[PDB]
Symmetry: C2
Subunit: 161 residues, 2 copies
């Protein structure tokens, strides 16, 4: 596959439901992200996440050629304001080299996030001068739900002694 | 026993200027003190240093001039700027509290997945209803707290990735 084709995909499959602002050289792209809850259902099948549960991020990354030493980042924010959560393979100490074509990257995180509506952001880059390959802001929406309501975004219910 | 005028005087006297505390309320009862244990029993500093994910104990000393029923004792955290990133109370926890005259001790615990950074602690005492809500002692912010993490993450949610791909 070629960069021009990827540039076309990048511009076409932009998510307007979230008003996705997408940019990058698109030498490789975040082709798709499927999100699993701990019961094995996808967000598509069931669009909620319970506060504190194990979430799995199933990426498909599509590259026109081999690219070494890339960073694949994921983050979440409220409808407004900066990210409330974010991390990447670089932080986690796992080096990634993209091979030509379609390939699978899987992340996990246990997210103690309070009830509410959030936005998921994803970024692909080569970490020489840094190269932004494919930034997807926001890539999709997600709603969290809890047994009861807390202040803020941290899910940490009090225990009365 | 203890009068409201005395509680008013303690309220003023022990306002925390170091945190620029804004403090108000009728002071029929006050949050006389909050002390924070890392739950294994030690007392943390004036500025507690807590690891992301640790269980933390909040030990309130409450002073009441008379009996007050239907009490809300809330606690929350913010960054130096912005609204609270975390907060809860006995009301949320479905635990009723009645204050008796004089001094008494109320204890909360929570396990706080909060990223490394400097934060501010707020706490508030109020009579819930039985008419109109009465603010007894609101303390914003009453002390500082520092979190540290094994490695730095974005935002305030402590939730490091596991990379399954290898
Ligand atoms: Cl999905």
């Amino acid at each position: 596959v070629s960069v021009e084709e990827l540039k076309a995909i990048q511009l076409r499959t932009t998510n307007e439901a979230t008003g996705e602002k997408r940019f990058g050289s698109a030498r490789a792209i975040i082709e798709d992200l499927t999100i699993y809850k701990s019961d094995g259902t996808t967000l598509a099948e069931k669009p909620l996440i319970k506060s504190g549960e194990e979430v799995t991020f199933d990426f498909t990354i599509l590259a026109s050629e081999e690219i070494k030493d890339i960073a694949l980042g994921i983050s979440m924010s409220k409808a407004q304001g900066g990210d409330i959560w974010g991390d990447s393979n670089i932080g986690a100490g796992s080096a990634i080299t993209l091979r030509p074509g379609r390939q699978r990257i899987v992340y996990k995180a246990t997210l103690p996030i309070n009830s509410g509506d959030y936005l998921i952001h994803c970024g692909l880059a080569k970490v020489g001068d840094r190269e932004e390959l494919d930034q997807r802001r926001p890539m999709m929406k997600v709603k969290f739900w809890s047994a009861r309501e807390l202040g803020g975004v941290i899910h940490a219910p009090l225990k009365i002694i």
